[PDB]
Amino acid sequence: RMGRVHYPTYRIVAVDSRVKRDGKYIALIGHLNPALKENKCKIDEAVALEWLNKGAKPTDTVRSLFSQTGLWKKFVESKK
Amino acid sequence: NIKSNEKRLRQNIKRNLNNKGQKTKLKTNVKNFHKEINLDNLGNVYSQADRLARKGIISTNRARRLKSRNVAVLNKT
Amino acid sequence: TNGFEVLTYIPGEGHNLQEHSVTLLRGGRVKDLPGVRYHIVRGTLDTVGVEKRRQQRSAYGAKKPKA
Amino acid sequence: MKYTGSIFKRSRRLGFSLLENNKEFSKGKKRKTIPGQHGNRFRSSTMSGYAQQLQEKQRMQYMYGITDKQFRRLFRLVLKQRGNLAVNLFRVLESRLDNIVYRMGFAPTRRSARQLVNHGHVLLNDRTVDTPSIILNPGDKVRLKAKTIKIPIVKAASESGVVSPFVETNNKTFEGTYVRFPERSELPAGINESYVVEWYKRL
Amino acid sequence: NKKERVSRLVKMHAQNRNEIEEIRAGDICAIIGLKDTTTGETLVDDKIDVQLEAMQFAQPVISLAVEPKTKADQEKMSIALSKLAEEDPTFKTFTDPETGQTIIAGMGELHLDILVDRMRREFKVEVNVGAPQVSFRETFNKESEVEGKYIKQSGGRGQYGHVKIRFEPNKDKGFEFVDKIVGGRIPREYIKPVQAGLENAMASGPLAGYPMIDIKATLFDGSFHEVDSSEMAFKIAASLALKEAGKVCSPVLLEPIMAIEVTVPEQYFGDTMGDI
RNA sequence: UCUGAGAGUUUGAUCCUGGCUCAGGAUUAACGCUGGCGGCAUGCCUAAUACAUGCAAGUCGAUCGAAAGUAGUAAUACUUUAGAGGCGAACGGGUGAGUAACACGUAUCCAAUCUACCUUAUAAUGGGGGAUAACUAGUUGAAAGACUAGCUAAUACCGCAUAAGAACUUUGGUUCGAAUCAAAGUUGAAAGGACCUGCAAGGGUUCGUUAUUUGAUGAGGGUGCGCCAUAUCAGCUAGUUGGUGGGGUAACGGCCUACCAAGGCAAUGACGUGUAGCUAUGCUGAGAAGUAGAAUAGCCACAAUGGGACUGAGACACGGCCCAUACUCCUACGGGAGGCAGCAGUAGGGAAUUUUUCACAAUGAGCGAAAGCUUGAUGGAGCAAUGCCGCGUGAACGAUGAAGGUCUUUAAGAUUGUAAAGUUCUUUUAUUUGGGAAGAAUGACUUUAGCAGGUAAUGGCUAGAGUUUGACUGUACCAUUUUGAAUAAGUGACGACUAACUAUGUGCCAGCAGUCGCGGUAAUACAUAGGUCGCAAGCGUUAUCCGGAUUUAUUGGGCGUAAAGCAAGCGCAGGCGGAUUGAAAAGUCUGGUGUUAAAGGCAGCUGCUUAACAGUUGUAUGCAUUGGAAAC
């Protein structure tokens, strides 16, 4: 969490396996206000497809908001 | 102090003993190659280099380079 | 703490200087003498500061009068 | 200060009332004199326009009741927006919470308005407030937080309150709305714009 | 009135630390943490009654004085004596204007030897061994009329002063003054400065640096300039006159003799005789 | 939309140039004066000085032995890991000393690169062998432990066989010192879990095994460019310069070696000295620009000091090793142990910086199928006004100015002052009571439907349900919640610059002083008290930077006498330079393209009562490159 103290914030950051937080990133997915949980956030909807194209499995915790988005519905064709 | 480090410290020591044993085995094989040149010993040393580049003991690029030099110098015939 | 030694005017009435009492020198300006370029500070040292000053209250040992 | 502890010394030094007579009430032979003891056949030796700068800045400083750090901060806030910034400066100063609620007829004076706001006697559109900093915009409805409607002092003050044409007020339900921005001639313009912009020597 | 933070419990021994998480009631232990501590404190966390158990606390008897050898050393003795006073409530240390040095107190010599060992090994003090010194009063014989005298040119017009006054010492009444000028030979504004030239010397001595007390006077004669004037000249001349008066008439000190109520069960009273 | 304020000072008076000082902010600022609180951020710039304890890294029992233990007659259900082996421990932290450069930043070629775990997809998982940790016995010992022998397990390791594809080689087709294509000489890989199904023998689910290609990620090299000062640092350097041979190397290269050859750089400032982590950026200014390199971020580099090495993709490694140096500690005097520029913390220095604190709640990283575990990463609270910011010290009426104090030097008065008193209101803060947050439903787990290679089940993918994660918090916040104005403001100045004058003492003294400089008988300049003013829980105030200081001048200066034209000349390099018309487009302008991270400011907005703050869209040149332009 960053930003104003006592006010959590969590940008959806990019990391393959070994990029520590608050540093270099390949692409910014968007933002998130983790105070009122409704998945209200702007995303490219193609940058996640960018990860899905060449691996670098996404972080396991931001998975729920993408389930609300539904990335499997456009990801199931990864192995067909 | 630290405990797994000591386990790791003694873990690779035996590994290193075995690996240097096979490395000097390759060394004496390529020394026999140096003494006089034949097809059979060159094939044997290539077969050994295949295993050694196969493992992490020897870099694949170094093995490829050395085998290229050896075939280059034997093709003088 | 360095080897160089500087001269300094003594503001305030009387003096709490007692033949090698610790002092704390501070940037100052006195045009009456070539060699004085600093001042002693009153209010925090072995010198507890002095009264009879309330128009000026900070650059001295002057408390607020007890009243 | 928020409560300077003495207002007539300062006013008799300057000479500005609230509307026409509030700093004087025939209290001790109502007169136009300084509170000092240098006589009153003369005022001072040095004369400068910066003295008028100080007089106007104190008059605007205290007749709406702000501090000085907030003062420069809000000049910056208005500096954000372009145009004739002086009139915007004054209209934003008028837009302050205590200023508006006073202009609502809801407060005997700005000090009283800040006091009633401080102890939680105001509430608008589910927005409580304890800081006199609300900027009033068209579309704001202001309520009294009628839990404390038992107070007879507020209703007595609103009996003879001053009405403003650019807003709307109600005399009995303690409610109002901010219809429009403040106007130049409708308000005391003793503060001269050129002098105010003259004082701005920060940058 | 402080909520203290407790780090851990432990058992001290000369070898090393020995810590145990809990201890039952009625036992003894040591606590690391508890940012400030002194003897006989009561600590409450179970929200129970606080309590005190102290029926004796020794007071010091001996007073010794030690001079410093370095200014930072002096500050370090002050700090170290404060620390030892906090460590054990048995003795008090003073740096008073009566002596202007370190006034220590304790029981015996070997306790002081241990203290100097501590402040040498840890506190870096190089304490010396000396003898105590106490303040004394200082009176003086009944001298005759004295005169204050001064010419010095001081930045422009010369500064002049002549005074002729008498000091009659007596412990019945203090500083007096009688207007004994009938013609008006002296201005009234000169009445005060000469008196001032006395006050600066009412609490110090020129021979031993100890207060000269019971100083009476009366302005009897004097001399200034016609076309020139001076005000503090009177005070400076009076100070010089005080020095001159002290020079001539053999002042004598006055020492505080103490009452001692010595006790013994009539066994070591031989010490009492052979010493007293 | 952007675009610059003066004042004072040499003189009998009066002008040029010119310095100095103030009016403006800003700080990782002490310390006075102190002081109520809410958030808001920060808190060794100083000895890269040495340091106790807890924390700073573990994890796999669904890979195994092996002993041990709770319940078990027994078989063992289960426990748990000292141990082997598996992964990781190099990532994460802080420091900035040495480094003056390919360190950094930018554009780059890597026809010289490599990258385990992911990525699409491919090839297979046959067996064989024997040690050994642990355990046991002993010597040596409190321990340390070493040396023998016996006992084994495993995805540990070593052959055999087998190769899709790979390397290696030869022929045949390709590009603006190389690459692809068919054929073949040589050669090599391994393993078992867990479950289902099947009497079985097999088969399937899934981890992993061994191989391959797309990628990306990561690291490294060269290149052009820009990126301190110094002439009281004039010549400097010899694996140095060049190639060959050979070697080493993820990899190109005197990277290294042998053979010889003889340079290489330089006045366009090399070499050497002081000094510096760099950059983005912070501050200031109207800008050009100047100062600094705080927090925060990226790159590099270090790790008590100097070297040398192994490990694995990956290190020459804060807490992996060896040696030496230096220091500390223990000891049985036999011998060893140790590395806070990890967190706190200590000791010293230092004017100047905190907790010998808590939860892993969320998220990050490592392990694991999962129960989850580890985490001073992370987030909290503690201290500090250190800075920006809000907020208490009350509010309406109430007087010919209550007491006092001061002057009126003569005696209404004037003054602090409607502030006092008094009427009454109210609780920001302080008090009673109750309710009570969110952040935390993320997360796996426990149950269904469809989906699909595979039907025989077991597996997963989502739509739905339930299980919980809280140090925070007793918080935020709310409530016809109760006594109660009750719980309180300092602060420098008052001659002029800049604003507000009287009096006591004062007598070139005490003194005061940003500048002008005042003070010896009437001080508005000193102390004193009243009053007056300016800021404000801060005000004093020097170290600190720019602006004014156009006070080293592209913007934006001068040299006749105020400072300066050399004593003059022959002039190399260099700068500038007649007209005409031609190519071309180097400078230059201009239109697209890649890039110029995050963050800051600017504009628009969202959230907290309100800004400070955070988040969000654009916002920042410039470098390379495609196309026009030919005026100079």
PDB file of N, CA, C and O (backbone and C1' of nucleotides) in Angstrom, chain F residues 429-454:
ATOM      1  P     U F 429     -12.956  17.992  19.016  1.00  0.00           P
ATOM      2  O5'   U F 429     -12.186  18.522  20.308  1.00  0.00           O
ATOM      3  C5'   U F 429     -11.083  17.798  20.835  1.00  0.00           C
ATOM      4  C4'   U F 429     -10.095  18.700  21.533  1.00  0.00           C
ATOM      5  C3'   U F 429      -9.834  18.382  22.998  1.00  0.00           C
ATOM      6  O3'   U F 429      -8.896  17.335  23.191  1.00  0.00           O
ATOM      7  C1'   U F 429     -10.294  20.677  22.787  1.00  0.00           C
ATOM      8  P     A F 430      -9.175  16.182  24.281  1.00  0.00           P
ATOM      9  O5'   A F 430      -9.540  16.973  25.616  1.00  0.00           O
ATOM     10  C5'   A F 430      -8.636  17.013  26.713  1.00  0.00           C
ATOM     11  C4'   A F 430      -9.343  17.316  28.013  1.00  0.00           C
ATOM     12  C3'   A F 430     -10.426  16.331  28.432  1.00  0.00           C
ATOM     13  O3'   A F 430      -9.918  15.173  29.072  1.00  0.00           O
ATOM     14  C1'   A F 430     -11.284  18.511  28.579  1.00  0.00           C
ATOM     15  P     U F 431     -10.674  13.764  28.902  1.00  0.00           P
ATOM     16  O5'   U F 431     -12.054  13.967  29.670  1.00  0.00           O
ATOM     17  C5'   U F 431     -12.088  14.105  31.083  1.00  0.00           C
ATOM     18  C4'   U F 431     -13.500  14.071  31.611  1.00  0.00           C
ATOM     19  C3'   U F 431     -14.352  12.890  31.168  1.00  0.00           C
ATOM     20  O3'   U F 431     -14.102  11.709  31.907  1.00  0.00           O
ATOM     21  C1'   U F 431     -15.586  14.882  30.913  1.00  0.00           C
ATOM     22  P     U F 432     -14.529  10.281  31.303  1.00  0.00           P
ATOM     23  O5'   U F 432     -16.112  10.241  31.482  1.00  0.00           O
ATOM     24  C5'   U F 432     -16.701  10.275  32.773  1.00  0.00           C
ATOM     25  C4'   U F 432     -18.174   9.949  32.721  1.00  0.00           C
ATOM     26  C3'   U F 432     -18.565   8.792  31.819  1.00  0.00           C
ATOM     27  O3'   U F 432     -18.336   7.529  32.416  1.00  0.00           O
ATOM     28  C1'   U F 432     -20.043  10.605  31.472  1.00  0.00           C
ATOM     29  P     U F 433     -17.870   6.286  31.513  1.00  0.00           P
ATOM     30  O5'   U F 433     -19.195   5.863  30.737  1.00  0.00           O
ATOM     31  C5'   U F 433     -20.384   5.547  31.445  1.00  0.00           C
ATOM     32  C4'   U F 433     -21.573   5.501  30.521  1.00  0.00           C
ATOM     33  C3'   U F 433     -21.379   4.704  29.243  1.00  0.00           C
ATOM     34  O3'   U F 433     -21.529   3.309  29.441  1.00  0.00           O
ATOM     35  C1'   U F 433     -22.377   6.781  28.731  1.00  0.00           C
ATOM     36  P     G F 434     -20.523   2.286  28.720  1.00  0.00           P
ATOM     37  O5'   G F 434     -21.311   1.846  27.411  1.00  0.00           O
ATOM     38  C5'   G F 434     -22.672   1.452  27.485  1.00  0.00           C
ATOM     39  C4'   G F 434     -23.420   1.800  26.225  1.00  0.00           C
ATOM     40  C3'   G F 434     -22.832   1.267  24.932  1.00  0.00           C
ATOM     41  O3'   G F 434     -23.148  -0.094  24.702  1.00  0.00           O
ATOM     42  C1'   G F 434     -23.425   3.539  24.654  1.00  0.00           C
ATOM     43  P     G F 435     -22.138  -1.030  23.873  1.00  0.00           P
ATOM     44  O5'   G F 435     -22.390  -0.613  22.359  1.00  0.00           O
ATOM     45  C5'   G F 435     -23.693  -0.678  21.798  1.00  0.00           C
ATOM     46  C4'   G F 435     -23.790   0.115  20.519  1.00  0.00           C
ATOM     47  C3'   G F 435     -22.810  -0.262  19.424  1.00  0.00           C
ATOM     48  O3'   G F 435     -23.216  -1.413  18.704  1.00  0.00           O
ATOM     49  C1'   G F 435     -22.919   2.096  19.629  1.00  0.00           C
ATOM     50  P     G F 436     -22.201  -2.644  18.510  1.00  0.00           P
ATOM     51  O5'   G F 436     -21.161  -2.113  17.427  1.00  0.00           O
ATOM     52  C5'   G F 436     -21.603  -1.664  16.155  1.00  0.00           C
ATOM     53  C4'   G F 436     -20.648  -0.660  15.561  1.00  0.00           C
ATOM     54  C3'   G F 436     -19.194  -1.087  15.492  1.00  0.00           C
ATOM     55  O3'   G F 436     -18.909  -1.947  14.404  1.00  0.00           O
ATOM     56  C1'   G F 436     -19.310   1.075  16.403  1.00  0.00           C
ATOM     57  P     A F 437     -17.740  -3.041  14.547  1.00  0.00           P
ATOM     58  O5'   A F 437     -16.407  -2.169  14.571  1.00  0.00           O
ATOM     59  C5'   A F 437     -15.689  -1.900  13.378  1.00  0.00           C
ATOM     60  C4'   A F 437     -16.499  -1.078  12.407  1.00  0.00           C
ATOM     61  C3'   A F 437     -16.009  -1.096  10.968  1.00  0.00           C
ATOM     62  O3'   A F 437     -16.446  -2.238  10.254  1.00  0.00           O
ATOM     63  C1'   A F 437     -16.388   1.135  11.627  1.00  0.00           C
ATOM     64  P     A F 438     -15.424  -3.439   9.942  1.00  0.00           P
ATOM     65  O5'   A F 438     -14.983  -3.185   8.432  1.00  0.00           O
ATOM     66  C5'   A F 438     -15.952  -2.945   7.422  1.00  0.00           C
ATOM     67  C4'   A F 438     -15.603  -1.726   6.606  1.00  0.00           C
ATOM     68  C3'   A F 438     -14.397  -1.860   5.689  1.00  0.00           C
ATOM     69  O3'   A F 438     -14.739  -2.457   4.448  1.00  0.00           O
ATOM     70  C1'   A F 438     -14.285   0.188   6.895  1.00  0.00           C
ATOM     71  P     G F 439     -13.661  -3.295   3.602  1.00  0.00           P
ATOM     72  O5'   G F 439     -12.343  -2.402   3.644  1.00  0.00           O
ATOM     73  C5'   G F 439     -11.429  -2.391   2.558  1.00  0.00           C
ATOM     74  C4'   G F 439     -10.071  -1.910   3.001  1.00  0.00           C
ATOM     75  C3'   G F 439      -9.110  -2.992   3.475  1.00  0.00           C
ATOM     76  O3'   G F 439      -8.398  -3.585   2.404  1.00  0.00           O
ATOM     77  C1'   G F 439      -9.189  -1.250   5.073  1.00  0.00           C
ATOM     78  P     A F 440      -7.779  -5.061   2.545  1.00  0.00           P
ATOM     79  O5'   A F 440      -8.837  -5.990   1.803  1.00  0.00           O
ATOM     80  C5'   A F 440      -8.912  -7.384   2.082  1.00  0.00           C
ATOM     81  C4'   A F 440     -10.248  -7.752   2.675  1.00  0.00           C
ATOM     82  C3'   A F 440     -11.119  -6.568   3.085  1.00  0.00           C
ATOM     83  O3'   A F 440     -12.493  -6.933   2.965  1.00  0.00           O
ATOM     84  C1'   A F 440     -10.625  -7.865   4.987  1.00  0.00           C
ATOM     85  P     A F 441     -13.297  -6.677   1.597  1.00  0.00           P
ATOM     86  O5'   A F 441     -13.595  -8.142   1.049  1.00  0.00           O
ATOM     87  C5'   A F 441     -12.600  -8.864   0.335  1.00  0.00           C
ATOM     88  C4'   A F 441     -12.840 -10.355   0.359  1.00  0.00           C
ATOM     89  C3'   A F 441     -14.148 -10.828  -0.276  1.00  0.00           C
ATOM     90  O3'   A F 441     -13.913 -12.064  -0.952  1.00  0.00           O
ATOM     91  C1'   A F 441     -14.023 -11.600   1.947  1.00  0.00           C
ATOM     92  P     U F 442     -13.314 -12.073  -2.445  1.00  0.00           P
ATOM     93  O5'   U F 442     -11.766 -11.742  -2.255  1.00  0.00           O
ATOM     94  C5'   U F 442     -11.164 -10.657  -2.949  1.00  0.00           C
ATOM     95  C4'   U F 442      -9.658 -10.719  -2.891  1.00  0.00           C
ATOM     96  C3'   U F 442      -9.040 -12.109  -2.854  1.00  0.00           C
ATOM     97  O3'   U F 442      -8.956 -12.711  -4.134  1.00  0.00           O
ATOM     98  C1'   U F 442      -8.005 -10.740  -1.226  1.00  0.00           C
ATOM     99  P     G F 443      -9.283 -14.272  -4.324  1.00  0.00           P
ATOM    100  O5'   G F 443      -8.413 -14.998  -3.203  1.00  0.00           O
ATOM    101  C5'   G F 443      -7.006 -15.143  -3.336  1.00  0.00           C
ATOM    102  C4'   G F 443      -6.400 -15.701  -2.073  1.00  0.00           C
ATOM    103  C3'   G F 443      -6.953 -17.047  -1.625  1.00  0.00           C
ATOM    104  O3'   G F 443      -6.271 -18.132  -2.230  1.00  0.00           O
ATOM    105  C1'   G F 443      -6.938 -15.530   0.204  1.00  0.00           C
ATOM    106  P     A F 444      -6.696 -18.683  -3.679  1.00  0.00           P
ATOM    107  O5'   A F 444      -5.980 -20.104  -3.762  1.00  0.00           O
ATOM    108  C5'   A F 444      -6.678 -21.292  -3.420  1.00  0.00           C
ATOM    109  C4'   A F 444      -6.393 -21.726  -2.004  1.00  0.00           C
ATOM    110  C3'   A F 444      -7.342 -22.775  -1.443  1.00  0.00           C
ATOM    111  O3'   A F 444      -6.966 -24.092  -1.803  1.00  0.00           O
ATOM    112  C1'   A F 444      -7.146 -20.995   0.097  1.00  0.00           C
ATOM    113  P     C F 445      -8.056 -25.115  -2.389  1.00  0.00           P
ATOM    114  O5'   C F 445      -8.824 -25.635  -1.095  1.00  0.00           O
ATOM    115  C5'   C F 445      -8.108 -26.075   0.051  1.00  0.00           C
ATOM    116  C4'   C F 445      -8.974 -26.022   1.282  1.00  0.00           C
ATOM    117  C3'   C F 445     -10.355 -26.639   1.127  1.00  0.00           C
ATOM    118  O3'   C F 445     -10.345 -28.043   1.308  1.00  0.00           O
ATOM    119  C1'   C F 445     -10.554 -24.500   2.114  1.00  0.00           C
ATOM    120  P     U F 446     -11.248 -28.988   0.375  1.00  0.00           P
ATOM    121  O5'   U F 446     -12.706 -28.856   0.998  1.00  0.00           O
ATOM    122  C5'   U F 446     -12.942 -29.105   2.375  1.00  0.00           C
ATOM    123  C4'   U F 446     -14.360 -28.753   2.744  1.00  0.00           C
ATOM    124  C3'   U F 446     -15.416 -29.239   1.766  1.00  0.00           C
ATOM    125  O3'   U F 446     -15.804 -30.577   2.015  1.00  0.00           O
ATOM    126  C1'   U F 446     -15.772 -26.948   2.240  1.00  0.00           C
ATOM    127  P     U F 447     -16.327 -31.500   0.812  1.00  0.00           P
ATOM    128  O5'   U F 447     -17.717 -30.837   0.405  1.00  0.00           O
ATOM    129  C5'   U F 447     -18.184 -30.911  -0.931  1.00  0.00           C
ATOM    130  C4'   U F 447     -19.518 -30.232  -1.096  1.00  0.00           C
ATOM    131  C3'   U F 447     -20.087 -30.256  -2.503  1.00  0.00           C
ATOM    132  O3'   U F 447     -20.744 -31.476  -2.796  1.00  0.00           O
ATOM    133  C1'   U F 447     -20.251 -28.066  -1.622  1.00  0.00           C
ATOM    134  P     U F 448     -20.821 -32.007  -4.307  1.00  0.00           P
ATOM    135  O5'   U F 448     -21.943 -31.096  -4.971  1.00  0.00           O
ATOM    136  C5'   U F 448     -22.182 -31.142  -6.367  1.00  0.00           C
ATOM    137  C4'   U F 448     -23.084 -30.019  -6.812  1.00  0.00           C
ATOM    138  C3'   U F 448     -23.104 -29.751  -8.308  1.00  0.00           C
ATOM    139  O3'   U F 448     -23.985 -30.620  -8.999  1.00  0.00           O
ATOM    140  C1'   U F 448     -22.847 -27.709  -7.132  1.00  0.00           C
ATOM    141  P     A F 449     -23.531 -31.319 -10.370  1.00  0.00           P
ATOM    142  O5'   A F 449     -23.806 -30.207 -11.474  1.00  0.00           O
ATOM    143  C5'   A F 449     -25.117 -29.706 -11.701  1.00  0.00           C
ATOM    144  C4'   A F 449     -25.090 -28.544 -12.658  1.00  0.00           C
ATOM    145  C3'   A F 449     -24.162 -28.713 -13.852  1.00  0.00           C
ATOM    146  O3'   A F 449     -24.777 -29.420 -14.915  1.00  0.00           O
ATOM    147  C1'   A F 449     -23.751 -26.622 -12.830  1.00  0.00           C
ATOM    148  P     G F 450     -23.986 -30.586 -15.690  1.00  0.00           P
ATOM    149  O5'   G F 450     -23.420 -29.858 -16.988  1.00  0.00           O
ATOM    150  C5'   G F 450     -24.238 -28.980 -17.744  1.00  0.00           C
ATOM    151  C4'   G F 450     -23.438 -27.813 -18.270  1.00  0.00           C
ATOM    152  C3'   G F 450     -22.203 -28.179 -19.075  1.00  0.00           C
ATOM    153  O3'   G F 450     -22.504 -28.456 -20.431  1.00  0.00           O
ATOM    154  C1'   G F 450     -21.639 -26.548 -17.458  1.00  0.00           C
ATOM    155  P     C F 451     -21.617 -29.502 -21.263  1.00  0.00           P
ATOM    156  O5'   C F 451     -20.201 -28.783 -21.388  1.00  0.00           O
ATOM    157  C5'   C F 451     -20.074 -27.532 -22.048  1.00  0.00           C
ATOM    158  C4'   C F 451     -18.691 -26.961 -21.873  1.00  0.00           C
ATOM    159  C3'   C F 451     -17.547 -27.916 -22.151  1.00  0.00           C
ATOM    160  O3'   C F 451     -17.308 -28.112 -23.533  1.00  0.00           O
ATOM    161  C1'   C F 451     -17.121 -26.771 -20.140  1.00  0.00           C
ATOM    162  P     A F 452     -17.885 -29.425 -24.259  1.00  0.00           P
ATOM    163  O5'   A F 452     -16.586 -30.286 -24.577  1.00  0.00           O
ATOM    164  C5'   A F 452     -15.555 -29.750 -25.386  1.00  0.00           C
ATOM    165  C4'   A F 452     -14.297 -29.505 -24.594  1.00  0.00           C
ATOM    166  C3'   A F 452     -13.443 -30.722 -24.300  1.00  0.00           C
ATOM    167  O3'   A F 452     -12.694 -31.178 -25.411  1.00  0.00           O
ATOM    168  C1'   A F 452     -13.675 -29.474 -22.333  1.00  0.00           C
ATOM    169  P     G F 453     -13.109 -32.561 -26.118  1.00  0.00           P
ATOM    170  O5'   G F 453     -11.806 -33.468 -26.001  1.00  0.00           O
ATOM    171  C5'   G F 453     -10.784 -33.392 -26.982  1.00  0.00           C
ATOM    172  C4'   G F 453      -9.473 -33.938 -26.470  1.00  0.00           C
ATOM    173  C3'   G F 453      -9.504 -35.344 -25.891  1.00  0.00           C
ATOM    174  O3'   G F 453      -9.521 -36.347 -26.903  1.00  0.00           O
ATOM    175  C1'   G F 453      -8.287 -33.921 -24.447  1.00  0.00           C
ATOM    176  P     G F 454      -8.895 -37.816 -26.689  1.00  0.00           P
ATOM    177  O5'   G F 454      -9.278 -38.239 -25.199  1.00  0.00           O
ATOM    178  C5'   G F 454      -8.647 -39.359 -24.591  1.00  0.00           C
ATOM    179  C4'   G F 454      -9.266 -39.703 -23.260  1.00  0.00           C
ATOM    180  C3'   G F 454     -10.729 -40.117 -23.292  1.00  0.00           C
ATOM    181  O3'   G F 454     -10.901 -41.487 -23.616  1.00  0.00           O
ATOM    182  C1'   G F 454     -10.401 -38.505 -21.594  1.00  0.00           C
TER     183        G F 454
END
